[PDB]
């Protein structure tokens, strides 16, 4: 085998699986999914004695891109960290956040903007590193914001209001209110509202993918599957996650 050496020994035969997924979303103002897809990979970090024959079991939510395919992949892993597979999904995707924008014009001077985010996942799970990005027009002379959760700055250079939230549990609701003070502008120029975009990180796979087992068989050496210490983690992050306002 060109990817694994012969005499590997570990007192502690341990493995770690990472399900890493990017969820992409384009949503209309009223809540229609215009486009949604997940890109994921599974990274394995393995410390297993000898030359173990491994079998990776999941739950078929997935369109997969040296192993042997059978819901079930069989393989002898290289020692250390490696990428076990890449995959893509478009069906039955968990959208972790709903963004509900609201924009009222007030003469030619104010823009009243309210944005509500709802977390759609188990309340025992926490999203982290949440950022909500609200674009502002170029003739913006000032911004007032109120938000009961997190912090928000108008970043004039970036022409955006950036709302940051460290933690948010599932099945919760939060909102920000902004008043966008506008300069006079060429009348025929009308504002084409860019989307409100999110970033976040969730401890589950938006695809729905579940690891069911990783079975280790090593026929020469005197450890077996129930000897192997096995860990899994899921890191779902936003890709393009845009809601049209």
């Amino acid at each position: 085998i060109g990817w694994r050496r012969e005499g590997i020994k570990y007192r502690r035969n341990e493995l770690f699986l990472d399900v890493l997924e990017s969820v992409n979303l384009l949503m209309s103002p009223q809540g229609q999914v215009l486009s949604a897809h997940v890109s994921g990979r599974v990274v394995m970090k393995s410390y297993l004695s000898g030359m173990p024959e491994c079998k990776f079991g999941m739950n078929d939510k997935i369109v997969i891109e040296x192993x042997x395919x059978x819901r079930s992949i069989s393989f002898i892993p290289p020692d250390g960290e490696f990428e076990l597979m890449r995959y893509r999904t478009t069906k039955d995707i968990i959208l972790p956040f709903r963004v509900i924008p609201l924009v009222r014009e007030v003469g030619r001077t104010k823009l009243e903007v309210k944005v509500v985010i709802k977390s759609n996942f188990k309340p025992s799970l926490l999203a982290q590193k949440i950022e909500v990005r609200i674009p502002t027009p170029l003739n913006t002379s000032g911004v007032q914001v109120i938000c009961m959760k997190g912090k928000a700055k108008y970043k004039a250079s970036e022409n955006a209001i950036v709302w940051k939230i460290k933690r948010m549990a599932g099945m919760k609701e939060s909102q920000i209110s902004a008043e966008i003070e506008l300069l006079p502008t060429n009348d025929k120029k009308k504002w084409a509202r860019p989307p409100i975009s999110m970033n976040f990180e969730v401890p589950f796979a938006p695809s729905g993918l579940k690891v069911r087992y990783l079975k280790v068989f090593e026929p020469k050496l005197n450890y077996s599957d129930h000897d192997v210490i096995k860990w899994v983690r899921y890191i779902g992050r936003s890709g393009i996650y845009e809601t049209r306002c």
């Binding site: 770690f16 690891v211 096995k230 899994v232």
Partner: peptide, 6 residues
């Protein structure tokens, strides 16, 4: 984070 596999 890492959770024991069941």
């Amino acid at each position: 984070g890492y959770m024991p596999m069941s």
